[PDB]
Amino acid sequence: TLTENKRKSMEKLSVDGVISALAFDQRGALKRMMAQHQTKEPTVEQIEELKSLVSEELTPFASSILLDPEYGLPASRVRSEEAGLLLAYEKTGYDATTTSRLPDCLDVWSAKRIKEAGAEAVKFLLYYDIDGDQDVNEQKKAYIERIGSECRAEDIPFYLQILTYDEKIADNASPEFAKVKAHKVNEAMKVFSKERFGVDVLKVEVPVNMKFVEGFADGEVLFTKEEAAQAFRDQEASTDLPYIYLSAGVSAKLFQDTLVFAAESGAKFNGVLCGRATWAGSVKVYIEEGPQAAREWLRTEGFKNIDELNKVLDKTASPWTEK
Amino acid sequence: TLTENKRKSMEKLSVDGVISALAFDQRGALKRMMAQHQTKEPTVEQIEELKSLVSEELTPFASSILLDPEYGLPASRVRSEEAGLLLAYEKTGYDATTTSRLPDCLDVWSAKRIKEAGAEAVKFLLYYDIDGDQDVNEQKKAYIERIGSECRAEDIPFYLQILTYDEKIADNASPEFAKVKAHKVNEAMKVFSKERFGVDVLKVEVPVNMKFVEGFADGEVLFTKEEAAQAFRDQEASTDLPYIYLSAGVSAKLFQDTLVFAAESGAKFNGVLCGRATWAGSVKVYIEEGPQAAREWLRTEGFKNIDELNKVLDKTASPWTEK
Ligand SMILES: [Ca+2]
Ligand SMILES: [Ca+2]
C-alpha cells in the first residue's frame, strides 16, 4: 500500500504509471570517463557543469532524474519542471580487498536531508550475494531495515537498487556467473520485497545475461530463448512491488532489445532507471569541445537516444498503478 | 507531543511521570571493572550472568531497566513484570587514536529489531563536543537524524544519551574540563532538542563536576554553590524535552546529594538512568566470591543503594507528564 504523500511522490517520478527515469548519480565513474581526455584532473566545476547540461537538455524527455548529492544538486535545480527527482543515498563502490561489499550511507546525509533537498525519492544501492556469508547478509538486511524505516518516517518513496554478485566469482560477465544470475537476482528480490524492508520500488538487473542466450549470443550459448523467457517470468513472480530495470554491461540497442524480449516473455516491469548509454557521448565532447558543443550533442544525439528508449518503453512497460 | 504508542511505552518505563531506571548496558566499561579483579579475560557467561543477577534482584525497585542486546537479552527476560525495557543501539566505547568519537550502531540491529526484541525504547549514546570539528558534528547530527526517523517509523521512544568531551582535553575529570562542562552539556542539549532529531528523552550529565563545588569539594573549589545552581538552571532552560541524569559512576551518596542540589537549584529533571552508582560494588563480589555472594550483595548493599536513591527521587524528580 502507499500513503498519500508517497503516492503523490511516485506520480511525480513517472508518466502514466511508467518510470522513464534518467540515471546520472555517477561520481567516480563519471570522473574517470572524463579522465580519458585529460588536460588535468577533472574539477568539481567540470563535473557539476556536465550534470547540469544533461539535466537541462534531457529531463524534458524523462519522467524523473536520479542525481548524487555530491555533484548533482546544482543539476537538480535546473531540471525540467515536468521531471521528478531522486537522490542517491549510498557511498559509491566497494572494497576490492574483501568480498562483503557492505553498504554505507553518505556521511552528512539522511532521508530527512534528502527530502529537504527536494527529492521525491531516496535511492540506495546494495550489493547482495544471496548465497554469501550469512552474517554479512544479516548486517546488510539490518542496514536496509533502517533506511526503509527512515523513508517511512519521512514519507518519501524508497527506491532500492540491487546489484548481485558471487563472493567467489570474480567476473560478473563470466559464463560462470551467467549460470547463477537468475538465482542471485530473483532470490534477492524475494528477500527485499518482504514488508520489513520498507521498499517502494526495486531497481534490478534483468535476471539473465543476454549475451549467452540463443539469438543474442555472439559466442558461447548457455540458454534457449524459452529458458531466458522463464527467468523473466520467475522474476515477475519474485515480487509484488513495482520494479524497474537498470542497464549493465550492455549497449543501448541490446538493452532496448532486452526490454522487448522481457515484455514478450511476460515480464511486467514498470520502467527503467537508465542513463549511461543516453549521455555517454556528451562526455568526450564536453571535455574536448566545451559546454556549448556538449549542449548541442545533447540536443541532437542526446534527444535521439532518449527518444528511441521512450518509444521502446511505450510498447513494453507496464504501469505500476496496474498492481 | 507523543503518539499513542510512544506514550504507552513511556508509561511502561515510568511511574507517575518519573523515570527511575536502572542502567546496565555497560560492556567495555564492565569489562574494565571486571579487569581490576581477575587474571583471565571475562567470559560471555560471566557477563551475561551478572547482568541477569542485577536484573533479577534490582528491577523490582526500578520503573525500567536499560540493557545491551549483546549480553543483556537473557537478563531482559527475567526482569520484574512491573519494569519496562530499554535496549542500547550503539557500539561500545570509542576510538582513542582520534578525537572524532563517531557514532556507530550495532551491526545486526535496527530500531525495528530492538522493538521486536521487546524493548519499549531505543537508547543511543553519542559523544559530543559542541566546540569540536564542525564537519565531524555535521556527520553526528545526520546520524542522529537517521535514528530519530527510525524511531518515529517504528513508533518507539528515542532515548538519546549525550556524553560530552573536549577534543583537546584528555581527562573529563580534570579541573580544566570542569570549567567548560556546563557549556558542553547545556549547548549539546539545546542542539539535540531540535525537532529534526526526533528525541523523546535526553539522558544527560549533570552540568557541573560536583567534586569542585563548595560544600561538596574535598579539595580545590572552582565554583560557589550559587554558580553550580545557575548551571542547573541553565540546563533546565536548554530543553523542553524530558531529561534524566546518569550517575557517571560517582558514589551512591554523592549522586543522591547531587539530585537534591539539582532540585533545590530549580532543575526539573524527570528521573535517572542510573547504573554504576547502584550496582558497582557487585562486580568485585561476583568475580571474587561468585554469583550467590553477588546475589546476596545485591539483596543488601545493592538494594540499599537503589532504595535510598528512590527515596531521593521521590522528593526531587519532576514528572514528564506535566508537559
Ligand atoms: Ca521545537
Ligand atoms: Ca525546560
From Swiss-Prot, chains A, B:
GO terms for molecular function: 6-deoxy-6-sulfofructose-1-phosphate aldolase activity; tagatose-6-phosphate kinase activity; tagatose-bisphosphate aldolase activity. GO terms for biological process: 6-sulfoquinovose(1-) catabolic process; D-tagatose 6-phosphate catabolic process; lactose catabolic process via tagatose-6-phosphate. Belongs to the aldolase LacD family. PANTHER family: SULFOFRUCTOSEPHOSPHATE ALDOLASE (PTHR39340:SF1). It is an enzyme of class 4 (lyase). It catalyses: D-tagatofuranose 1,6-bisphosphate = D-glyceraldehyde 3-phosphate + dihydroxyacetone phosphate. It comes from the Bacteria. The gene is lacD2. This is Tagatose 1,6-diphosphate aldolase 2. The keyword Lyase applies. InterPro entries: Aldolase_TIM, DeoC/FbaB/LacD_aldolase, LacD_aldolase, Tag_1.6-dipho_adolase. Signal peptide: none annotated. It holds the Pfam family DeoC. Its EC number is 4.1.2.40. Pathway: Carbohydrate metabolism; D-tagatose 6-phosphate degradation; D-glyceraldehyde 3-phosphate and glycerone phosphate from D-tagatose 6-phosphate: step 2/2. Keywords: Lactose metabolism, Lyase.
